[PDB]
Each structure stands twice: as structure tokens, then as C-alpha cells.
């Protein structure tokens, strides 16, 4: 999620992803813990038979018939964690996520309550404001000519600098705002 994607997936990444999917779907098939442990160790042994293989064409032939076999026996109703992109509580709390700038439109009678919070917010806004001009310059001087090649942002290199484009990553509402 946080880490920037790569231009492509290597063979080891693909085999690791297949291993993850196969073990998860095997756990979905094998409800009980001991049965899952036995069959997962059996699957690990089946996977590590060809670990030391060197031929790239034969390696590509491998993992492909494995993906086909996985698709044939992929447990059409697999287990999904509640907050996962397929879970029952994937986006339950997205209706309670309110942006930070909404507080700028509060009535003064509402800002009369919670004065310390708005003072700290003022310090945060000043820090963002002073910081922003420098961040743009860093991005301008650090970005390779011809535009970025990978959507990875550099860290702050000086003392008083801050990571470029940090405001909307630091100011996420919450995971469970209410």
C-alpha cells in the first residue's frame, strides 16, 4: 500500500505470491489447525523440490502449471479478513472519515470549545506553510531531468527540512475516527 510499485514483478516475487495465495486457500479448505499444518508442510515440501532449479525456461514452465492447478482448486469462497478489500468490514468506517480542512469552516462559537487543539493546529499550519516552499525546491532540484521514473519520494536531507509531500500522509483522519 505505502510502498511505491515497481515496473514489473520478478520471478521470485511471483513464486512468493503464488505460495501465499496457495497457502491461504489451503487454510480456507482445511478448517482445522492440525490438518492445515500437515497439508501446509506437505505443500512447502512440494514447493521446495524445485528451489535449486537453474533453467529459466523450465522455471517459467514451473509456477505456470502451478497457477493453473491453483485456479482449478482455488476454493471459490475463500477466507477474507474483515478489513481486507473483500471482507465484510472493508469500508465500514469510511463514512466517519472527515477531512482536516473542515475545521477551518467551524463557527467561532464552536472554536471557543477546544482552544488548545486549534492553537496546536495553528502551529501545524505555520509549519506546513514555512516548510512547503523548501519542499518544492527540493523536489525540483532532486527530480531527474525528463520527469520522475518511479513514484517514490525522497526523504529530507537537511536539518530543518521535512519529507516532501508530507502533509496529507501525516494528516490522515484515523483508522476508526468514531
Amino acid at each position: 500500500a505505502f510502498s511505491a510499485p515497481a515496473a514489473y514483478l520478478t520471478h521470485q516475487q511471483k513464486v512468493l505470491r503464488l505460495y501465499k495465495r496457495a497457502l491461504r486457500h489451503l487454510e480456507s479448505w482445511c478448517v482445522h489447525r492440525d490438518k492445515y499444518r500437515y497439508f501446509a508442510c506437505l505443500m512447502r515440501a512440494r514447493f521446495d523440490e524445485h528451489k535449486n532449479e537453474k533453467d529459466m525456461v523450465k522455471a517459467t514452465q514451473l509456477l505456470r502449471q502451478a497457477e493453473e492447478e491453483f485456479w482449478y482448486g482455488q476454493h471459490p469462497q475463500p477466507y477474507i479478513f474483515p478489513e481486507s478489500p473483500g471482507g465484510t468490514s472493508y469500508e465500514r468506517y469510511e463514512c466517519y472519515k472527515v477531512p482536516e480542512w473542515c475545521l477551518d469552516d467551524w463557527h467561532p462559537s464552536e472554536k471557543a470549545m477546544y482552544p488548545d487543539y486549534f492553537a496546536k493546529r495553528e502551529q501545524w499550519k505555520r509549519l506546513r506553510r514555512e516548510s512547503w516552499e523548501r519542499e518544492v525546491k527540493q523536489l525540483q532540484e532532486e527530480t531527474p531531468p525528463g520527469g520522475p521514473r518511479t513514484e517514490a519520494l525522497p526523504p529530507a536531507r537537511k536539518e530543518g527540512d521535512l519529507p516532501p509531500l508530507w502533509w496529507h500522509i501525516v494528516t490522515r483522519p484515523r483508522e476508526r475516527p468514531m
Binding site: R33, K35, Y38, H75, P76, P82, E91, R92
Partner: protein, 603 residues
């Protein structure tokens, strides 16, 4: 004078006071849910009096209090019907709703908009009470649409979730498909019987034709989620557990069946519609049970069980036993609501975990939920002298001892077996094995709200069947004589299902793994009906709506025909007429030609 009317209107009237006070100050405090729960409990204990009067005397009423618009010879008025059905269904619904709000007090403890949730629940209850007591078709339609809109609002309670909005729109779509038949029935009844009142409709239809009954059957299939329009009920489990326990399990989803109960004088005079109803109920209950016996989400299993029970109710209606179907509604509300409450308690205890693959040993980890779920499953499958027996046993006997179709009876028996199968599946996969939940145990039941709400419906699910059956007057001829083997058909079928499903489930412990068969894939994917029917038609509609309706005709051809052709023709004629180089020779020659034509043509 005659307190029956005053009490039976006062219950519904006092059901609406918290809606009035929703704009007051109490709505902004945390005592609002307690206010609503107390109001509902008082409404139930107040409606217990008309039930007592009816049981004593058999007293029935029609209260046509307010006069709405009068349209020539057709008069529309605010009329409430207080027959056996209304005065019996109101207390049960109020009791279930009281239990549901008491449970939601604890289940929605951390929800910021809990007062709005309770207001929505009360509004749904008000709309359902409007639907049940309606004496004319317009008020019944008002309730029909109110319950649907409240279901739409409550399914999409978490509006930040895409799937909740999708499920709400699905439910609205299927209910409008039923609305088509409902409106057809209304139009036919007004055109031919000249009234929407129940009395005039019953009087002027000695032998009811096919079309109004087919419209009523379509509306009932739409609202009760029969086989043709089933998937919206399984998909409605996206809403909060109290919503699934109140609306989509016990009160709202029976409404369509109730409709067919209300028009039973016209139902018995038609044979084709009865056969269609019986076949639809049989196929619905079979298909829903078969889909249920292989699900992993507990809420989905309970919803499919509810749909199977609705199919059984439709079969009972089809075999000319409306009162028995009403009794089944009354018992099913009790035990299915309590079952859903147990499911919600388990769900909350395991940190919002719904799949049964992560639920292990709970027989000792949580005992009260265990005993409540066991009692509910026993009542649902049918244990003699329990609340489910007095209904389902008579259902089976009436099906066996009457002139029906063989296939419908076979599917009813197989559906009973599959009901036992998924009940034992739930119990085995959720209560018997070793624990499989995450290590951080947060199991807790020490809360009086949940315990009291569950135990009230427990006492109901144990005693209410006997009390109600022995209290109401006899409304049909009993099957006093029976073959000894055919007397025990339901019991042996249920026991066989229990034993076979337990034996099949016990083989999961075996250290052997085999790929699934085609039948398992068909049953797990809901007969593949949700895939095809939610991908093939919709696309083929939406694409057309942009290709032919929007672009081809509206944007191109309708534009080409009238405006663009006129513009092109006028531009061409203007260019031709105005393009004169200014040479008087050509104009003078044209004038000479015109003079010659005028001299040679106009004389």
C-alpha cells in the same frame, strides 16, 4: 365504549410519539434509545389487551376514521382492519422489536449515530404496522413502500461502503419488480370491482379471474424473495446485525406472504394460481436450503434459512391453509429473531468475525449463547412440543394429506432435511471444534441487556407455540387420522438429515484432502444465479442505454432528421439565392425569362 378500538388505535398512535420528539432535546442525549425501547415495551403490553379480548370473544372490527378524497363512486378513507391477523401479529412484532432494540443497545454501543439508528428502526416498525392493519389497497401500498424504503436506508447504513449501497439498490430493484404486479392488481381491482376496500373486493369476486391473483403472487414473490427474485435477501446482510435480525429475518420479509394471506377468500376460488404458488414455494425453499448447506458466512446461512422458511410458508398458502401459514409466521419470527441475536452476539464477541472457519470452541467459552442457539436450532428443525413443532409439523401433515403435486411434496421433504443439515452444520462448525479465533481473546457476555433480550425470546421460543395454539379458536379441519409411518415422516426426515450431515461433517478431521466436485461449486455459488443474472442483463441494459437510446437516436438521428436537415437545406438555399456576382446582364436575362413565363402561363 368498546375499548377494543381505543386500545388498538392507541398502540399504533403511541408508537409514533418518539418520532415527534426526535426534534426535541432528548434526541440529542444518550437516553433516546432507552426512550424508544420503553415506548415499544409499553406499546406491546398495551396491545396485549385486544389480543385477550379477541381470545375471549372472537371480536373483530373495521375502523374507518378519517375520510380522504372521494373520486366519483370510489371512496378512499383511512380505514384500519383489526381481524384475527392484525391483533395477533401486532403483539409478536412488538415483542420481537423490543428484544431487538434491547440487543442493539449493546451491539450499537460504539456507533456515533445510534439515535438515528433507533429512529430508523421505529420508523420501519411504524410502516410495518401500517401495512399489517391496512383495510384498503392504498394504505397497504403505503406500508409496502415504507418498509421497502426503510430497508433501503438501513441496508446502506454505512454509506462509505460500496457493497452496502449496491445491496440497497439491489433490494430496491427486486421490490420494484414486485411493485409492478402490486400495481397491476390494484388497477384491475379498481377497474372491475370499483373499489379498493377489502370488503367490496371480497364481495364482488365470487370466482376471481387469473390476472389480479397473478399480480398479487408477483408482488408476494418480490417482497418475500422467492426463487425468481431471491438474491436480494441474501445480499441484504450487509446491514447491521439488528437490521438483519428485525427486518430481513422475521418482520419485513414475511410481508408478501401476509399479502397472500389477506386475499385468501379469492385465493381458494382459483386453482391455477394456487398451483403456481405451491410450485414457487417448493422450488424456493429447496434452492435456498441447498445454497445454505454449504455457506461459510453465518449471517448468509441464517438468511438462506429464512428464505427457505418463506418458501415453506408459500407452499402452505398454495395448499389452501392460510391460517397455518400465519401461525408459521408467528413462530418463525420468534425463533429466527433469537437465532440472529445469538449470531450477532457471537459476531461481536469475536471482534466482528463472520466466517465460520475462524470460530471454534464456544460451547464452554460462551454458555448462554450456546444454549440459546441450541434451543433455537431445535425449534427451527422441529422438536415436538416446541414452538416450531406446532407450526411445521402441521405444515408437513397438511402437505402430505392433501391433493398436491408429487414434486412439490418431495422438494418440501428434501428442504426439511436440508434445514436440519444446515442447522447441524452451524452448530458443529461454530461450537464443537478446537478454537480457531485470533489469540487475543475478547469473549464476554456479562451484560444484562443482551442476556435479557435473548432470554425473553428464549421463553417465547419455548412456550409461545403451545400457548397460542391452545388459545386461538380452531380454524380448519384437523388431520385426526393418519398412517403411523406418515405421522412420523417429518421426524424421521429431520433425524436422517441430522445424522447424515453430522457424519459428513465429522470427516473434515480426517487427514485427507480432495478437490471439490461440480455440485459443491454449484451450491456454493448460489446456483450461479447471482453471477449471470447480475452481469448479463444489467450490462445489456446499460450498454443499450448509452449506445442506442442516448447516442444513436437522441444525439444523432433525432438531431439529423428535424434540425440538422432544416439547417443544411436553408444554408444551401441561402447560398444559392444570394450568390449573385452583381452583373446586371444575368439579372436582366432572368427578368426577361420571368416576363415571358408570366405572359405564357398566367393567361
Amino acid at each position: 365504549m368498546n375499548p377494543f378500538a381505543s386500545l388498538t388505535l392507541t398502540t399504533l398512535t403511541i408508537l409514533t410519539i418518539p418520532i415527534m420528539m426526535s426534534n426535541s432535546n432528548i434526541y440529542k442525549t444518550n437516553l433516546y434509545p432507552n426512550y424508544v425501547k420503553t415506548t415499544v415495551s409499553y406499546a406491546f403490553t398495551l396491545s396485549l389487551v385486544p389480543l385477550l379480548m379477541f381470545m375471549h370473544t372472537g371480536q373483530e372490527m373495521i375502523i374507518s376514521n378519517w375520510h380522504w378524497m372521494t373520486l366519483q363512486t370510489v371512496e378512499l378513507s383511512l380505514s384500519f382492519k383489526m381481524d384475527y391477523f392484525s391483533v395477533m401479529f401486532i403483539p409478536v412484532a412488538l415483542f420481537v422489536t423490543w428484544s431487538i432494540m434491547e440487543f442493539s443497545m449493546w451491539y450499537m454501543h460504539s456507533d456515533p449515530f445510534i439515535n438515528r439508528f433507533f429512529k430508523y428502526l421505529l420508523l420501519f416498525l411504524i410502516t410495518m404496522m401500517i401495512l399489517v392493519t391496512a383495510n384498503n389497497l392504498f394504505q397497504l401500498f403505503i406500508g409496502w413502500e415504507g418498509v421497502g424504503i426503510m430497508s433501503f436506508l438501513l441496508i446502506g447504513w454505512w454509506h462509505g461502503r460500496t457493497d452496502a449501497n449496491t445491496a440497497a439498490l439491489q433490494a430496491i430493484l427486486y421490490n420494484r419488480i414486485g411493485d409492478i404486479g402490486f400495481v397491476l392488481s390494484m388497477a384491475w381491482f379498481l377497474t372491475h370491482s370499483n373499489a379498493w376496500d377489502l370488503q367490496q373486493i371480497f364481495m364482488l369476486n365470487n370466482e376471481c379471474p387469473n390476472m389480479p391473483l397473478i399480480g398479487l403472487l408477483l408482488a408476494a414473490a418480490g417482497k418475500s424473495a422467492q426463487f425468481g427474485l431471491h438474491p436480494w435477501l441474501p445480499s441484504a446482510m450487509e446491514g447491521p446485525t439488528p437490521v438483519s435480525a428485525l427486518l430481513h429475518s422475521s418482520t419485513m420479509v414475511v410481508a408478501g406472504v401476509f399479502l397472500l394471506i389477506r386475499f385468501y377468500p379469492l385465493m381458494e376460488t382459483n386453482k391455477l394460481v394456487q398451483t403456481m404458488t405451491l410450485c414457487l414455494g417448493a422450488i424456493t425453499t429447496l434452492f435456498t436450503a441447498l445454497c445454505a448447506i454449504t455457506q461459510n458466512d453465518i449471517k448468509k446461512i441464517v438468511a438462506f434459512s429464512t428464505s427457505s422458511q418463506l418458501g415453506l410458508m408459500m407452499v402452505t398458502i398454495g395448499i389452501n391453509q392460510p391460517h397455518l401459514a400465519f401461525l408459521h409466521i408467528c413462530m418463525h419470527a420468534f425463533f429466527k429473531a433469537m437465532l440472529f441475536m445469538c449470531s450477532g452476539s457471537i459476531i461481536h464477541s469475536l471482534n466482528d468475525e463472520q466466517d465460520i472457519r475462524k470460530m471454534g470452541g464456544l460451547y464452554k467459552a460462551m454458555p448462554f449463547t450456546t444454549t440459546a442457539l441450541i434451543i433455537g436450532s431445535l425449534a427451527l428443525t422441529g422438536m415436538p412440543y416446541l414452538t416450531g413443532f406446532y407450526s411445521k409439523d402441521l405444515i408437513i401433515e397438511a402437505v402430505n394429506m392433501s391433493y398436491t403435486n408429487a414434486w412439490a411434496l418431495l422438494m418440501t421433504l428434501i428442504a426439511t432435511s436440508l434445514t436440519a443439515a444446515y442447522s447441524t452444520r452451524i452448530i458443529f462448525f461454530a461450537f464443537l471444534g478446537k478454537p480457531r479465533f485470533p489469540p487475543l481473546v475478547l469473549i464476554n457476555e456479562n451484560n444484562p441487556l443482551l442476556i435479557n433480550s435473548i432470554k425473553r425470546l428464549l421463553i417465547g421460543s419455548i412456550f409461545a407455540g403451545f400457548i397460542i395454539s391452545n388459545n386461538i379458536p380452531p380454524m380448519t379441519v384437523p388431520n385426526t387420522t393418519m398412517p403411523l409411518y406418515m405421522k412420523m415422516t417429518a421426524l424421521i426426515v429431520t433425524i436422517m438429515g441430522f445424522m447424515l450431515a453430522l457424519e459428513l461433517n465429522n470427516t473434515t478431521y480426517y487427514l485427507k484432502f480432495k478437490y471439490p466436485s461440480q455440485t459443491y461449486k454449484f451450491s456454493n455459488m448460489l446456483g450461479y444465479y447471482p453471477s449471470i443474472m447480475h452481469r448479463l442483463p444489467t450490462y445489456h441494459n446499460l450498454s443499450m442505454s448509452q449506445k442506442s437510446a442516448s447516442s444513436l437516436l437522441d444525439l444523432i438521428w433525432l438531431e439529423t432528421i428535424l434540425p440538422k436537415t432544416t439547417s443544411f437545406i436553408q444554408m444551401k438555399m441561402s447560398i444559392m439565392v444570394s450568390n449573385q456576382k452583381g452583373l446586371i446582364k444575368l439579372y436582366f436575362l432572368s427578368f426577361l425569362i420571368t416576363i415571358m413565363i408570366s405572359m405564357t402561363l398566367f393567361n
